[PDB]
Ligand binder design. Sequence first.
Ligand SMILES: *[C@@H]1O[C@H](CO)[C@@H](O)[C@H](O)[C@H]1NC(C)=O
Ligand SMILES: *[C@@H]1O[C@H](CO)[C@@H](O)[C@H](O)[C@H]1NC(C)=O
Ligand SMILES: *[C@@H]1O[C@H](CO)[C@@H](O)[C@H](O)[C@H]1NC(C)=O
Ligand SMILES: OC[C@H]1O[C@@H](O)[C@H](O)[C@@H](O)[C@@H]1O
Ligand SMILES: OC[C@H]1O[C@@H](O)[C@H](O)[C@@H](O)[C@@H]1O
Length: 606
Amino acid sequence: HHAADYVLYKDATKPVEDRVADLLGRMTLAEKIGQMTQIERLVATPDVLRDNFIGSLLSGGGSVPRKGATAKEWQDMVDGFQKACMSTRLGIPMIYGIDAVHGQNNVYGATIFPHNVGLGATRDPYLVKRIGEATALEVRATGIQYAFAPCIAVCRDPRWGRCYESYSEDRRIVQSMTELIPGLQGDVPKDFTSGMPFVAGKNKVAACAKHFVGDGGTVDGINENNTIINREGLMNIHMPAYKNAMDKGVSTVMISYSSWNGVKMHANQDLVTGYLKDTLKFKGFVISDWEGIDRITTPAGSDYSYSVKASILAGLDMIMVPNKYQQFISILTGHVNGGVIPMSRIDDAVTRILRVKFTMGLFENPYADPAMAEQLGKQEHRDLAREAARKSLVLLKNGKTSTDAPLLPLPKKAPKILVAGSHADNLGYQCGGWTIEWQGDTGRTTVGTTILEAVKAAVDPSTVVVFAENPDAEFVKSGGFSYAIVAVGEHPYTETKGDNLNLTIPEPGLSTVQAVCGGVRCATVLISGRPVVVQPLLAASDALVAAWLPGSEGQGVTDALFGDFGFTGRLPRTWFKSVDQLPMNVGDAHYDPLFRLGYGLTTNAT
Ligand SMILES: *[C@@H]1O[C@H](CO)[C@@H](O)[C@H](O)[C@H]1NC(C)=O
Ligand SMILES: *[C@@H]1O[C@H](CO)[C@@H](O)[C@H](O)[C@H]1NC(C)=O
Ligand SMILES: *[C@@H]1O[C@H](CO)[C@@H](O)[C@H](O)[C@H]1NC(C)=O
Ligand SMILES: OC[C@H]1O[C@@H](O)[C@H](O)[C@@H](O)[C@@H]1O
Ligand SMILES: OC[C@H]1O[C@@H](O)[C@H](O)[C@@H](O)[C@@H]1O
C-alpha cells in the first residue's frame, strides 16, 4: 500500500490482526523470545534492550529513577528505554508496566486513592471507574503505558497481607468494581467480543486482572499458599470477576503465586490454557508474577529449566523475569531448539503480546507526551480521591449508649480541640503499602494532607487545635478540650509482611485511645487494611470510624467527621469477634460476626 519500502505491520491503517501476522512472520526466534521477556528497569540498559530484543520493562514497588523524581524525569527514563527498543531491526516498541494500584503510587506527587477494601465500602462502581480514568492520566503523565491493576482477589480470610487489595469478601462487589478496567483502558465499542484486549489510545493504559486465580482463598490467608476448594467453589467465588474482566476487554491477566488444590497456578495448564484462554476466549496476554515461575519449585529457583518449561507449556505468554533475563532467554531458546516447547507455543505467546501492543496504539505512540506531565497530582483528581476517601468510611459507633447525644458530626467551632494518635499526622500510615516504597513508609513521603492538617483546614478560625501524638490521661483531663479526634491503626505492609495471625493493632494505639477518651469525648479513626480486633477500641470510644487506608486526601475523613457530608460507607467484609473464628464468611454455619457484611451507621449532612 504504496512507497517502495512499505512494511504492512508499520501501517497504522491496517487491521490489528493483519499487522500482528505480518510482523510475526518476519521475526527470528531471538526476536520472538525477546517479546516474551519483561525485565526490571534496574537491570535494563540500551545495549541490553537492543541485544536481547526485550519486549517489556517494569518498575516493581519502589523502583524509581530517583527519589522525588518529577513526571518529566519518569518520561525521560521511559523514552530512553523506548529509543533503544525502537532501534532494533524490527523496531518493536516495549510496553512499560508498573503497580498503579491506588493511583500512580510509586511516584512522588501522584494522587493516592483509597486502597481497594475502602473502595468496596463505597458500593460505587462509577466512582471506581472515575478513579481508573484519573489513574490512567497520572500513569501516562509519567510515560508509562500499562498498570498491573485491578487486583480482583476475593479475600476470604483477613489474616492475608493483601486483604486491603481486595474490594470485598463478596464476589458480587468485586465483580461490580471491575469498572476500574474501562476507566483505565477506555470503554469497549458496541460490537465488542468478550475476551479481546482493548485500550482506547495514548491517554489510556493497558490493565491487568490479577492474580489468576484464587489468590484470596489461601489456607489461613497465608500469602502465596494453597487454595483448597472444589471446582464449584473456585468457580462460584474466585472466578466470576475474571469473566466481567473479559467482557470489559482487560488487556492482560497476571498469574498468581498461589496454588489450587496443590497445583501451582504458574504450572496449571488446565486453568491458564483450558479455562482462561480456551473457555473464556481471553485473547490478550498472560503475564507471570515476579519470579513466579521460579516459585513453581521447592525450593524456589532450584530447577529454573523446569520453571521455564512448566510455565510456558501451561500457557503463560510474558515472563516477569525480572532480573535474570540472559538465563531465561538462554533456557527458553534451548527448549525450543530441543523440541521440548513447540514453535506453535512461542508464536501464540508473541501473537498475544503483539495483539495488545498494536491494539493499544503503541506502534503509533511509542513515546511519552510531555503535555501530560502536568496531570500528576492534579487538583481535580485529588478532589475525586477526597470524595472516595469520604465515601469509604464506615461509621461503626456514634455514642456509647443508645441514649447519649450523637458525637458525630462534630462542631467546627469550639474553643480548643485535641488531635492525637500515631496515625493523626502521618501521611505514609494513612496511605499504607504500595505507596512510594513497595511496603509503604512512615511520615511525609509524598504530597498530601494528613488528618491533622485536614482538621486545621476545616475548623473555624477561633478553634484552637492541639496535636499530641500520645498524650497521657492527665494531659487530656487538664487540657480544656471540647472533644478529641484520635487516629490509630496498622502500619503499612504489603504481601507476606502483612500476613498476620493475631490482627491486633500495634501499641501504643489502644493505650492512646483509652487515655484520650477517658479524658474528653472522642471520635476514634481506625486506619487499617482489614478488620482488626476492635472491641477494646469500641469500649473506650464515643464514636469509631473504620477509615481503611484512605490515601493522600485526609480531608475525606474530616468531610464526614464535621458533617459536610453524611456517613454512607458499609462494611465490604465481615468484622469478626475473634481471630479464632477465622475463616468466617457470610453464608457459613458458625457465622457469628461482630458486624455483618453491609453494616454501617449513617449521619445526615449538617
Ligand atoms: C504453605 O506454607 C507452608 C509453610 O510455610 C509451606 O511450607 C508450603 O510449601 C506452602 N504451600 C504452598 C502451596 O505454597
Ligand atoms: C501479630 O502479628 C504481627 C505480624 O505477623 C507481628 O508483627 C506482631 O508482633 C504479632 N503479635 C503476636 C504474634 O503476638
Ligand atoms: C437523617 O435523615 C432522615 C430524614 O430524611 C431520617 O430518617 C434519619 O433518622 C436522619 N437522622 C438524623 C439523626 O437526623
Ligand atoms: O515480589 C517481590 C518484589 O516485588 C517488587 O514489586 C518489588 O519491587 C521488590 O522489591 C520485591 O522484592
Ligand atoms: O511489582 C510487580 C508484582 O510484584 C509482585 O510481588 C506482586 O505479587 C504483583 O502484584 C506485582 O504486580
